[PDB]
Amino acid sequence: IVGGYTCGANTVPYQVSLNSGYHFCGGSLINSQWVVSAAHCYKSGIQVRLGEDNINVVEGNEQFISASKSIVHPSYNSNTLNNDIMLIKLKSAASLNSRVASISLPTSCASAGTQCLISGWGNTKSSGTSYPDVLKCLKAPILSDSSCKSAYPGQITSNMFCAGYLEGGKDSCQGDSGGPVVCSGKLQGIVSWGSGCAQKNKPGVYTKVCNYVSWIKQTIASN
Numbered sequence: 001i002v003g004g005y006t007c008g009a010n011t012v013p014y015q016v017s018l019n020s021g022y023h024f025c026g027g028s029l030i031n032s033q034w035v036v037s038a039a040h041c042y043k044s045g046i047q048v049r050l051g052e053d054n055i056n057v058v059e060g061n062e063q064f065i066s067a068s069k070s071i072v073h074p075s076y077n078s079n080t081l082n083n084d085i086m087l088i089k090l091k092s093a094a095s096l097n098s099r100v101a102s103i104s105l106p107t108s109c110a111s112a113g114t115q116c117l118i119s120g121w122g123n124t125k126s127s128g129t130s131y132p133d134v135l136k137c138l139k140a141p142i143l144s145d146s147s148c149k150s151a152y153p154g155q156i157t158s159n160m161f162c163a164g165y166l167e168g169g170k171d172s173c174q175g176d177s178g179g180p181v182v183c184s185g186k187l188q189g190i191v192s193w194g195s196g197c198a199q200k201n202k203p204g205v206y207t208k209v210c211n212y213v214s215w216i217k218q219t220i221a222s223n
């Protein structure tokens with residue numbers, strides 16, 4: 001997260017860290033046995049880390065649970081990043097408490113103007129590389145479809161939305177991938193892609209979760 005602030009230990013209880021020997025992507029806990037992340041975060045041998053703040057120090061509220069199954073969206077296109085969403089089932093259910101909690105799926109799509117909370121352990125520099133050990137947060141508004149499409153000609157689908165600031169300076173970045181975009185208590189986006197990080201006229205692009213609610217519900221009910 002570039003231009004954000006330190007969230008504070010367990011203030012974003014649904015935030016997960018996907019670990020394969022090291023943190024490589026974020027994710028959101030949607031219930032006690034399921035995690036939602038970006039399809040581009042797909043890997044085998046994933047361990048889901050819940051209740052995390054500092055990812056390099058055992059602080060006491062963590063739950064490390066291995067994934068039993070991963071399901072990439074049937075129409076995911078790795079070249080365009082269309083349908084960049086994936087579900088991960090935990091081998092055992094997480095113990096939900098005040099520090100580890102699920103986030104609600106949306107009942108309707110969010111519109112431009114809505115302020116959301118984006119979080120992750122990704123790169124904090126627009127030019128250069130610096131990865132934080134503790135969770136970073138950023139409040140950012142959802143941008144109009146017109147602005148989004150003007151920024152990325154022919155690359156924005158109905159399954160994507162832009163959020164951030166056209167003036168640059170604040171944005172999610174590499175390492176934040178798969179992480180949550182929560183607006184008014186509902187999971188509306190998943191950190192997907194962008195041209196650089198926090199660059200002028202190059203806002204972050206996120207997966208539009210509201211278009212996948214039925215797929216998510218059906219998949220969980222049958223797996």
Ligand SMILES: CC(=N)N1CC[C@H](Oc2ccc([C@H](Cc3ccc4ccc(C(=N)N)cc4c3)C(=O)O)cc2)C1
Pocket residue numbers: 079080081155171172173174175176177191192193194195196197198203204205
């Ligand atoms: C070629 C083209 N026009 N495309 C449009 C869709 C797709 O975009 C991508 C895919 C992977 C990357 C990563 C880099 C990359 C990876 C994750 C990111 C997460 C967030 C942000 C952000 N600024 N909010 C930027 C990221 C940039 C790479 O270079 O490998 C960057 C952009 C391909």
Ligand SMILES: [Ca+2]
Pocket residue numbers: 052053054055056057058059062
């Ligand atoms: Ca820790």
